[PDB]
Amino acid sequence: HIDLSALNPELVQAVQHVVIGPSSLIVHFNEVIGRGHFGCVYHGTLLDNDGKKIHCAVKSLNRITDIGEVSQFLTEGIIMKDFSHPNVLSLLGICLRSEGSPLVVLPYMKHGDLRNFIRNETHNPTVKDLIGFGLQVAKGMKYLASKKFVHRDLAARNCMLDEKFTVKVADFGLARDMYDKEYYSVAKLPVKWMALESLQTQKFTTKSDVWSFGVLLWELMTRGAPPYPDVNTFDITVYLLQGRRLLQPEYCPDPLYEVMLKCWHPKAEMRPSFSELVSRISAIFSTFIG
Numbered sequence: 001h002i003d004l005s006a007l008n009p010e011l012v013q014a015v016q017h018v019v020i021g022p023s024s025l026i027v028h029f030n031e032v033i034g035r036g037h038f039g040c041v042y043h044g045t046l047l048d049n050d051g052k053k054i055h056c057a058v059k060s061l062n063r064i065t066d067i068g069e070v071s072q073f074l075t076e077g078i079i080m081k082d083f084s085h086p087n088v089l090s091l092l093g094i095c096l097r098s099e100g101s102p103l104v105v106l107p108y109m110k111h112g113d114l115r116n117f118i119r120n121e122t123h124n125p126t127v128k129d130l131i132g133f134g135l136q137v138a139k140g141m142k143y144l145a146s147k148k149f150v151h152r153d154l155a156a157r158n159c160m161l162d163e164k165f166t167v168k169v170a171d172f173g174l175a176r177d178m179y180d181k182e183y184y185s186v187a188k189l190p191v192k193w194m195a196l197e198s199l200q201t202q203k204f205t206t207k208s209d210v211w212s213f214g215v216l217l218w219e220l221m222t223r224g225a226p227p228y229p230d231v232n233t234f235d236i237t238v239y240l241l242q243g244r245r246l247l248q249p250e251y252c253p254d255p256l257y258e259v260m261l262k263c264w265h266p267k268a269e270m271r272p273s274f275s276e277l278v279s280r281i282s283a284i285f286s287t288f289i290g
């Protein structure tokens with residue numbers, strides 16, 4: 001029972017342009033994908049004009065009493081609405097209901113998030129497969145960078161993986177907390193994925209997304225190891241400034257580690273673009289038979 005009239009009117013039209021009628025969406029409330037402090041995610045079924053059922057994920061707020069939270073939640077969906085790329089998560093629409101939270105509707109991702117997938121010892125991606133996942137993230141980021149979109153929380157935990165093992169760059173946003181508390185430290189910042197200059201200024205750019213991408217590559221090559229496990233979250237700046245980087249994973253090819261070190265260049269301006277990363281990683285990927 002939100003009052004649409006209290007919201008920013010630009011925001012509300014934007015939402016109406018991607019609206020899903022409540023009768024077209026069935027939320028399976030008994031089938032919870034995750035719960036957090038601010039939000040939760042359910043399995044859902046979306047019907048289109050022909051009655052074709054689409055399996056989706058349905059994101060909700062836990063409270064609708066704060067106009068800032070509601071506005072922020074809707075704004076997260078609107079930020080997404082024009083992302084149209086095979087390696088970026090898309091928005092199915094937003095469902096405004098007479099009572100309760102508005103609902104953000106996402107295509108269902110069979111294999112959940114990338115970090116949990118590569119940590120699952122019941123799948124066995126090859127080194128080539130893992131580099132391929134990295135290449136897909138780079139392609140999604142090349143697309144987002146071309147739109148001048150800065151991600152700010154690129155990490156394996158925020159990338160999704162569908163039934164075809166296509167990686168979709170995403171951001172759990174208000175539902176980041178469902179899992180993954182410890183990696184965010186006081187606004188809660190993902191400090192072990194952050195560029196040196198962001199640690200110092202809390203400002204983010206495409207070049208700091210590149211630093212994060214370097215850490216994501218390290219996550220891939222270690223099959224989801226936590227970075228800097230021995231370092232207190234509040235001390236990562238001191239640690240890096242001693243002259244340190246993440247070590248080369250055992251099965252990380254030398255040229256890929258060189259790419260990681262480029263992503264962590266002390267000068268943001270000198271880090272490779274995502275266009276360059278796509279080119280470089282495409283070449284490294286191609287040297288593997290399987």
Ligand SMILES: O=C(Nc1ccc(F)cc1)C1(C(=O)Nc2ccc(Oc3ccnc4cc(OCCN5CCOCC5)ncc34)c(F)c2)CC1
Binds near residue numbers: 116172
């Ligand atoms: O992603 C977002 N924005 C965004 C930002 C930057 C960008 F580049 C792209 C999108 C926003 C967002 O809310 N994203 C989001 C991403 C994943 C979300 O969670 C899921 C979506 C689709 N399928 C899912 C599937 C899933 O698990 C599937 C079942 N698992 C599978 C693995 O093993 C156990 C069972 N878990 C969460 C899913 C979600 F509810 C919201 C803030 C809007």
